[PDB]
């Protein structure tokens, strides 16, 4: 099984104030999101979803489609030791 970590870059400054930029109902526009956490430093926030495949190559094709559907646009990196594809925005 392979996995897709969809990630966004956060800037953060016990309440923790952060922000990231997200695409909007218009695809060529991005808007800074007011994100707070309650119990500048840069952080990466990810969520991971799944698939089974025969190939590291077939898994990418699938995950690429997933991301394209969801509107995730970023850099793609792969680590075969943990068989994890990552898409990072920002």
């Amino acid at each position, epitope marked *: 099984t392979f996995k897709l970590a969809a990630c966004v870059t956060l800037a953060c400054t016990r309440v923790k104030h952060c922000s990231f930029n997200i695409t909007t109902d218009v695809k*060529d526009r991005k*808007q*800074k999101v007011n994100a707070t956490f309650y119990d500048l430093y840069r952080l990466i926030s990810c969520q991971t979803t799944t698939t089974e495949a025969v190939d590291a190559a077939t898994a990418a094709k699938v995950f690429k489609q997933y991301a394209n559907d969801n509107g995730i646009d970023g850099e793609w990196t792969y680590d075969d030791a943990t068989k994890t594809f990552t898409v990072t925005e920002g």
Partner: antibody, heavy 136, light 110 residues
């Protein structure tokens, strides 16, 4: 885009006055705004700036905190609350728009929280000004 | 602390003049955010240069701007009668305040 100041007048030192500025012809709630003043025969002096959503404001040392900027976006109005007035506050007061828009990079237009404009660091619309004269 | 400008400059029509605007590393020297305003009697000022060297749409190509270290400059070439007026520089500062220069009266000797 038009800005129209009012509330100016002839007053005595120690008094208070509230200036208003009615904005029209642009989306007031997305743009930063300033007050700038000019005493008769003298130079421009920046008074204060307020962020589009009113979440942050800044004032010159010479006027903090006798003169305070605020805004009401539901009324497209900018205010300057002037307390403890001094003769040296005598000036024309201009309401002024901070030029602004998206930050364009990597093929994307980036906007601030709630779609607010980023600042372009120059002033692109001015009212005609309102006169304040402070004298004993 | 106001940015330092000469009190006055003057030139004949067709000549070039330059007005300086001296600040510190926390304003003029710290950002590419110097703008310049022309003001005629009884009117609001009007921007003629921003971001050091950029012209707003419609502003004559005779107006140009530059900066080196903590000093910015506005140059007006091919002086015309209508250039006469007062000129003010402005900069963003490190505390997000703004600050104007002391202003310069330009006379076009017509």
């Amino acid at each position: 885009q038009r800005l129209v100041e009012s509330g100016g007048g002839v007053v005595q030192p120690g008094s208070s006055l509230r200036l208003s500025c009615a904005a029209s012809g642009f989306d007031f709630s997305r743009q930063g705004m300033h007050w700038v003043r000019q005493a008769p025969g003298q130079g421009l002096e920046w008074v204060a700036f307020i962020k589009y959503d009113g979440s942050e404001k800044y004032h010159a040392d010479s006027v903090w905190g006798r003169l305070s900027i605020s805004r009401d976006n539901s009324k497209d109005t900018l205010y300057l609350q002037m307390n403890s007035l001094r003769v040296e506050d005598t000036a024309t007061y201009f309401c002024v728009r901070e030029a602004g828009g998206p930050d364009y990079r990597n093929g994307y237009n980036y906007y601030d929280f709630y779609d607010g404009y980023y600042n372009y660091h120059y002033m692109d619309v001015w009212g005609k000004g309102t006169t304040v004269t402070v004298s004993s | 602390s106001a940015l330092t400008q000469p009190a006055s400059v003057s030139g004949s029509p067709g000549q070039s003049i330059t007005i300086s605007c001296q600040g510190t590393s926390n304003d003029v020297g710290g950002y590419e955010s110097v703008s310049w305003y022309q003001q005629h009697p009884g009117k609001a000022p009007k921007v003629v240069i921003y971001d050091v060297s950029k012209r707003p749409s419609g502003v004559s190509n005779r107006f140009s701007g530059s900066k080196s270290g903590n000093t910015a400059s506005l140059t007006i070439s091919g002086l015309q009668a209508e250039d006469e007026g007062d000129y003010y520089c402005k900069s963003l500062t490190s505390t997000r305040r703004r600050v104007f220069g002391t202003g310069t009266k330009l006379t076009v000797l017509g």
